[PDB]
Amino acid sequence: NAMSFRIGHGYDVHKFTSAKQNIIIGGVEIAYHLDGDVLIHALCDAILGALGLGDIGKHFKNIDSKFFLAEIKKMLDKKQYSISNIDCTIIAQAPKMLPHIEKMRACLANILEIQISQINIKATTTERLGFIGREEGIATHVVCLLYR
Amino acid sequence: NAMSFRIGHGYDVHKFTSAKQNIIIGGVEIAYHLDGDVLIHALCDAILGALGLGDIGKHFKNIDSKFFLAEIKKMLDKKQYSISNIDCTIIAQAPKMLPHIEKMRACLANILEIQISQINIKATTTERLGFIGREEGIATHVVCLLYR
Amino acid sequence: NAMSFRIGHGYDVHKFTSAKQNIIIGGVEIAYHLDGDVLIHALCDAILGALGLGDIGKHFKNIDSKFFLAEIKKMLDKKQYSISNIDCTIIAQAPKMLPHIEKMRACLANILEIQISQINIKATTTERLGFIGREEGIATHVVCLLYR
Ligand SMILES: [Cl-]
Ligand code: NA
Ligand code: NA
Ligand code: NA
Structure with missing residues (x-):
């Protein structure tokens, strides 16, 4: 018989989030920023890509990207x-x-x-x-x- | 026997063209901008790429890119x-x-x-x-x- | 039997170096700029990439990139x-x-x-x-x- 090959391609971008001091507003302290693993993300995209499955978005937060x-x-x-x-x-x-x-x-x-x-x-x-x-x-x- | 596989890669960029009001000059009204399907373009490039055919440019306007x-x-x-x-x-x-x-x-x-x-x-x-x-x-x- | 296929991908960027006039400092003339073949570089990267060999960096200046x-x-x-x-x-x-x-x-x-x-x-x-x-x-x- 014969075999089948398939190519995927992922591409991901992560914007750095500067850590800046927590602020108080209306007396409550709110920690903020001004998560995603860029590689595992592009990698998942490439694989679903190769399979004609779209992207990670078609199939789905703070869980380890390894999951x-x-x-x-x-x-x-x-x-x-x-x-x-x-x-x-x-x-x-x-x-x-x-x-x-x-x-x-x-x-x-x-x-x-x-x-x-x-x-x-x-x-x-x-x-x-x-x-x-x-x-x-x-x-x-x-x-x-x-x-x- | 055996089979042959080939990879292509296309990459395309489209600059958005802002629509701004038509202008009159020397009494004649000229509509202007300040066309290309970016995906079908990169796609054609990938295919000709895989074949060692160069790019769409080697082989060729307002015609539907589907053509x-x-x-x-x-x-x-x-x-x-x-x-x-x-x-x-x-x-x-x-x-x-x-x-x-x-x-x-x-x-x-x-x-x-x-x-x-x-x-x-x-x-x-x-x-x-x-x-x-x-x-x-x-x-x-x-x-x-x-x-x- | 069967055969094996492998994909590589290289990506390289070259910053243009403006040529500007030589300067003298402490009486000595110093030519400066303010080398790398971008294609052969990405190409080597793709090949070592396909082989699981990392990048050109894992294996190694002014020598012709053809080398x-x-x-x-x-x-x-x-x-x-x-x-x-x-x-x-x-x-x-x-x-x-x-x-x-x-x-x-x-x-x-x-x-x-x-x-x-x-x-x-x-x-x-x-x-x-x-x-x-x-x-x-x-x-x-x-x-x-x-x-x-
Ligand atoms: Cl920019
Ligand atoms: Na696919
Ligand atoms: Na080719
Ligand atoms: Na590899």
């Missing part, structure tokens, strides 16, 4: 596709990703039950240009290849 | 490749895409003569950052996988 | 994968790429020892929006598909 990834792993099995490989590009002026990347790979390879060598995570910069260069936020691109 | 997509469908057949699947990411702060996405999928699946499940369209935002966050325009990323 | 591409060609052989095809999107408001693209394709197809038709290079614009629209720099997206 969602685990639900996507199940949806993946029900559709009877496997991961061939995953490639990730984190785009950030900062923080510095390099120290944490292998941890990310092990973490996700585990949840997804593939080999570390089947999921690549690299980080680049915009060279201080655009909203990412000004450190207003970060983005990630994910591509996945699925097989049956 | 071009139909010519790309023919070029695809002459090269004897088929679509495995297509993944699309629309990047926009607005308008709101969600209501129109299924229409897009049906429309394009039809022209391309594949299953709706073979073409995925998702929409994300830049979270109000960069030119897209300021609503100056929109972009789309397309990836396609082709087989023989 | 690095040639080392990536060797790493590719040691892992025993082949290029199915490569798709490149150069994002620039300028300079004008169109005249130089075929040269790029021949150059890289040669080093990589594949057919010109196996590597596609297209160029688009941001329509004068964002850092690329303001001509502050350029980016490239590469996707590659590898087989065994």
Whole structure:
């Protein structure tokens, strides 16, 4: 017989939220900001993308994003596709990703039950240009290849 | 025997054109702006990309973009490749895409003569950052996988 | 038997460096600016990406970028994968790429020892929006598909 391959692509952006002092109003103290895991998000998007399932939005807060990834792993099995490989590009002026990347790979390879060598995570910069260069936020691109 | 797979990638950007009142000059009324379907454009690019055909520019105005997509469908057949699947990411702060996405999928699946499940369209935002966050325009990323 | 496919994705950005007159300080003349091949860079990233090898950074200045591409060609052989095809999107408001693209394709197809038709290079614009629209720099997206 023959086999089937499918590509997904996720893209996500996270805006940094500056922490600023809590304020009192009408005598009550309100902590504020002025959550989302950008990579796992783009990754879920890529996988549902490859499957013609739309995005994470079609299927669904403060729960560890790892959970969602685990639900996507199940949806993946029900559709009877496997991961061939995953490639990730984190785009950030900062923080510095390099120290944490292998941890990310092990973490996700585990949840997804593939080999570390089947999921690549690299980080680049915009060279201080655009909203990412000004450190207003970060983005990630994910591509996945699925097989049956 | 064996089979062949090929990846394309399109990327397109559309700048919004503000509608502003018509002006008279030298006594003649001139309507102005201060056309392109961004998705079908990136999509054509991805397909010609996968085939080593360059871009839509290598092969060619106000004609419905669906037409071009139909010519790309023919070029695809002459090269004897088929679509495995297509993944699309629309990047926009607005308008709101969600209501129109299924229409897009049906429309394009039809022209391309594949299953709706073979073409995925998702929409994300830049979270109000960069030119897209300021609503100056929109972009789309397309990836396609082709087989023989 | 069966075969294996793998996707890579590279993304690179280059900031233009304005040439401005040399300055003298403490009586010594210092030439300054206020190097990297963006495409070959994203391309290497895509290939190492597909292989679960991280990025060019994991494996390594003023040497012709073609060299690095040639080392990536060797790493590719040691892992025993082949290029199915490569798709490149150069994002620039300028300079004008169109005249130089075929040269790029021949150059890289040669080093990589594949057919010109196996590597596609297209160029688009941001329509004068964002850092690329303001001509502050350029980016490239590469996707590659590898087989065994
Ligand atoms: Cl900007
Ligand atoms: Na799809
Ligand atoms: Na190609
Ligand atoms: Na990989």
